[PDB]
Amino acid sequence: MKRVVVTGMAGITSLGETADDIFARFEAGKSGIRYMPEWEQYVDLRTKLAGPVETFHIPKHFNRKVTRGMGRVALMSVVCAETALQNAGLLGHEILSSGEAGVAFGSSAGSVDAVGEFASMLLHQSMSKINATTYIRMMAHTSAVNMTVYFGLKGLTLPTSSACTSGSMAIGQAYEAIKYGKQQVMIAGGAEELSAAGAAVFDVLFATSGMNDQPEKTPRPFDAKRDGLVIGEGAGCLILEEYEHAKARGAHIYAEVIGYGSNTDGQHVTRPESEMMGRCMELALKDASVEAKDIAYVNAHGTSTDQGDVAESQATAKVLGYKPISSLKSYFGHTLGACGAIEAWLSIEMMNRGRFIPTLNLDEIDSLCGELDYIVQQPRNLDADIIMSNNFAFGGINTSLIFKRVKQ
Amino acid sequence: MKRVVVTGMAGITSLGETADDIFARFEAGKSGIRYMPEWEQYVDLRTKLAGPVETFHIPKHFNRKVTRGMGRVALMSVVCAETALQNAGLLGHEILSSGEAGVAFGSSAGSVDAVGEFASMLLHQSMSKINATTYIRMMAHTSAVNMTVYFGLKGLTLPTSSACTSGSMAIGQAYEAIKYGKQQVMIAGGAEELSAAGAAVFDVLFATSGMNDQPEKTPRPFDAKRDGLVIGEGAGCLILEEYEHAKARGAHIYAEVIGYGSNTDGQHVTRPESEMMGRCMELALKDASVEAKDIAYVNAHGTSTDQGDVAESQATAKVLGYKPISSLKSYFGHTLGACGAIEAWLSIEMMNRGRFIPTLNLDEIDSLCGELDYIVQQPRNLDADIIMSNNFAFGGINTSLIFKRVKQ
């Protein structure tokens, strides 16, 4: 069994494209949420809040030919992955084309523009909108495929498109591929592009927030006055690497991946089950050979829905006790496929800073949520050696990831 | 490390829903390809050929409440999987809800009706078409999620939606989950529903056959006069089980899964590279600790495209040498997400019968294709102890599966 480390990290968020910039907005206490005037034209849509990425740097070599098979979600993904590879010192490295480097990546869906082209045939009886890149741009593994083609990867392609667990499932499966000796380097993460149709699927479940006139005070994970989630977009990426390989080249190491757990509720497509969420955390603890006491901080899923926040916090409290916990969805909204990767990236940053971010707009802890050490109001300084990051998605898919500090 | 066996198998195809019925149609030389008058309405669509499933049995208990989150692709998947579990003796078994049983499944896309609802907002702004099951039915992991909910699975959900490799990647990942001790039973396979938009994706690549007036003569894998693929639909499913668990209950064993290789071309998004296809077969041989000499028969991907058949057959010849080979896409067309699972199922049946099916309509072997033992005209009787089944998809995703006979 091989040990697995994180040697590169990057993300694209509504709060910025570097951890320094994002943590500066964390301290300022401002979220990426805003009212969406462009969504007034959808009359049945009750929510009008989102966390878009207004801009992100696109290097000039991402030209017309390079990006022909990329919609927004795939372009954000590949640009994010290039920054993470550059961070790791592996951009243009021989290992990328060796067969020993691969990718795990997912999103809830491909590009909605390309989905519209594919659907225009069943409606308008016309093939004129479908073109040579419609499927590449629309398909749910558009990010992973565009990455192997762009970087020339010849190892494993692991498509972990599983809605809200896409990015955490990617990290876990990439970790396993290196742990079991199949690969030496993996690009791992998730991404999602924003669309009003994406908001609609949660709006028809009455899971969205209605506070359209107060974008600055919603979503409110675990808050007694929360009224649903707000969706966002972005991308997150970790570069995972076999430990001896990383040490041999003198690489900087951000964290060690020591546990991954995943299981399934087996009950309902949308309503989570507390008991199985907690079992997933126990699977990760067992995979890491650590106990609840050894976990210093938990990054919750914490979507700000009613029964989602209750099920998660009760299970976390049952398995881990009175642990420090917070949700970054208070800042970004629910970034869907991206969330597990963005949350793992920024939680590793918290561990390396010794500074753990509170849940924004958590003012009164809901009495129906589990007894946890909710970080509120201001960042909490902790000497944390081991952290846990949890995510839960439609179909009852659960993931739990455990990361450990590395001193070099 | 655990051994992994196949204890249940099922599929739904244009040639029938039992192995006996399908093999009767093999012997008669009758494909499932037909002319599609219902596609005349799409004027820009050049191909008018497909391999639809006209009917399959749906048990009574699949009522409207049970199937409200299933489109056609998911219903075929769940029905197929129930039949496979029945075959294995595990339907309703306590292990299914124990946490030790899971699912690996994929398709190229979810239900096209649901994709249309999702695009009603993108196109006509009218939201009266999105409902509470639109995403569950449209999403590319609709089969896997519907199966965990329907059967009460609490183990791993492994979404392997990777276009043409969905079903083979599901078998391989399910096999690894058992081999590495994470699960004791896995439902594994793939599925696809037929749609004109799916044909158009290949039509615009000039990859489809235009022999619309001769459906009984096309597709023609490896044939000197082939002119592209024809798409089909269906589902395939294997029940994989840890070997000691199967033996302890006296289960019938159809095969042992002994090797899985997967890699990526890293060069082109639609045109496969021969060298990496061969490396993928080498990965499978190494995983199985067998040599080229030990492979008795190869079930080709064999889509009947110009460049695809040459790259695949040249790779096979280079890495395996002169081997018996045939393509079942000559009977079903290219069933996309289903193809790797249907082809694994029926190849295991060939092994158990000692009778290996010829490529239909392969009348003049292309001298540009590799030097192989192409089975033509009549089935070949073989005392085959080990077989290989290969699949290659968009994004240059390659899979190779090795199965071994089990004498009980």
Numbering used by the authors:
A (entry chain B), B (entry chain A): 1 to 408
Publication text:
Aryl polyenes (APE) are one of the most widespread secondary metabolites among gram-negative bacteria. APE biosynthesis gene clusters harbor two ketosynthases (KSs): the heterodimeric KS-chain length factor complex, ApeO-ApeC, and the homodimeric ketoacyl-acyl carrier protein synthase I (FabB)-like KS, ApeR. To understand the structural basis of the functional redundancy in the two KSs, AbApeO-AbApeC and AbApeR, from the APE BGC of A. baumannii, we determined the crystal structures of AbApeO-AbApeC and AbApeR in the absence of substrates. Therefore, the two KSs function complementarily in the generation of APE to enhance its production.
The crystal structure contained four molecules of AbApeR in the asymmetric unit. AbApeR was a homodimeric protein with twofold symmetry, and there were two homodimers in the crystal structure. AbApeR and E. coli KAS I protein (EcFabB) were remarkably similar. The proteins shared an amino acid sequence identity of 39% and the proteins could be superposed with an r. m. s. d. of 0.886 Å. The cavity of AbApeR was symmetrical and connected between the homodimeric partners, forming an elongated, narrow canal across the dimer. The residues lining the cavity of AbApeR were moderately hydrophobic. The volume of the cavity was 120 Å3, which was considerably similar to that of the AbApeO-AbApeC heterodimer. The cavity volume of AbApeR near the entrance is reduced, when compared to that of AbApeO-AbApeC, because of the presence of Tyr135. Mutagenesis at Tyr135 in the active site cavity of ApeR reduces the activity significantly, which suggests that the stacking of the aryl group between Tyr135 and Phe202 is important for substrate recognition. In the model of 3EN-AbApeR, the narrow binding site of 3EN moiety led to a dead end with approximately the length of three-double-bond polyene.
